[PDB]
């Protein structure tokens, strides 16, 4: 149940005070919680990041970060209707397609692309054929791992084709949802990292509140495809910046 | 100080094992 006590608050405070002064982690500005679940969660790791909805703290607005958008084959429909809409006309730093993306960016161009952007968002029909195009730098770890979006609010039936349109209000709504919420990727073992909060865009009670939000959404029973994956007793929590130790919370 | 407490804790846990 409820996880906000003096142990959690002291650990998170001491982590911020350590990362302000320590000359070994003055570049990574992030807090992750490591959930040590009881059992091994069974579902294998596809690289599709499911979305954990925070309830009362937008941790990122879609305009304070670089967004790369990856589209389908002809890309003219998505590029024009996204760039001359003025609901979405300034939201994407880049809009490209998979064919000319893998044509242009080969080798160290991918390292420059990694350092250039910080939100990779793909059309869901091309999201699966990305781990060869974007290489393994985007899939080792998870900080620039691409998100699925549906571009049209239209569903495919059998024996008939998806009519090719796109909806800029709908795609702004789901990028707003993506930047407003946090995310996780399931795996086989009992370790699971979830990003919660930033180093100066956030503070201790809101980081603690969204920590408890991710806990509730994860060990929930309903919301079962997207969130109900912790089937057993969640055993431990830790907080860490990417080069910082695992400050423990809630040892059950 | 709690930072150094817990990193010494995991260090001496591994040393004890």
């Amino acid at each position: 149940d409820i996880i906000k006590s003096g142990l959690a608050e002291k650990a998170l405070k001491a982590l911020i005070l350590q990362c302000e002064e320590n000359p070994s982690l003055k570049n990574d500005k992030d807090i992750h919680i490591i959930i040590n679940t009881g059992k091994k969660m069974g579902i294998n790791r596809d690289n599709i990041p499911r979305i954990i909805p925070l309830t009362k703290y937008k941790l990122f607005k879609p305009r304070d970060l670089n967004i790369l958008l990856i589209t389908k084959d002809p890309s003219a429909l998505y590029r024009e209707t996204l760039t001359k809409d003025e609901h979405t006309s300034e939201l994407f730093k880049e809009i490209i397609s998979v064919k000319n993306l893998r044509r242009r960016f080969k080798g160290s161009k991918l390292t420059q692309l990694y350092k250039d952007f910080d939100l990779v968002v793909a059309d869901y029909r091309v999201h699966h054929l990305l781990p060869e195009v974007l290489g393994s730098r985007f899939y080792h770890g998870s900080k620039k791992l691409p998100y699925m979006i549906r571009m049209s609010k239209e569903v495919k039936l059998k024996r008939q084709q998806m009519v090719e349109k796109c909806d800029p209000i709908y795609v702004r709504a789901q990028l707003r949802s993506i930047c407003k919420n946090t995310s996780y990727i399931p795996n086989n073992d009992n370790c699971l990292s979830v990003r919660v909060g930033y180093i100066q865009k956030h503070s201790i009670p809101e980081i603690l509140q969204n920590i408890q939000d991710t806990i509730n959404f994860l060990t929930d029973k309903s919301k079962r495809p997207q969130g109900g994956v912790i089937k057993g007793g969640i055993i431990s929590i830790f907080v860490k910046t990417s080069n910082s130790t695992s400050l423990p919370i809630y040892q059950f | 100080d709690y930072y150094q407490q817990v990193q010494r804790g995991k260090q001496d846990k591994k040393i004890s094992r």
């Binding site: 305009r63 304070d64 970060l65 670089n66 967004i67 300034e90 939201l91 730093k93 | -």
Partner: protein, 38 residues
Amino acid sequence: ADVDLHKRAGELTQEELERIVQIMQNPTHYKIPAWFLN
């Protein structure tokens, strides 16, 4: 800033030029996205 993006920069009224320089002076509260400026 509503100034037409085809005018030459000489023929600028001072309210248009002060709107331009006001937007470029305080870009954050005019909710300009943070990737335009580095």
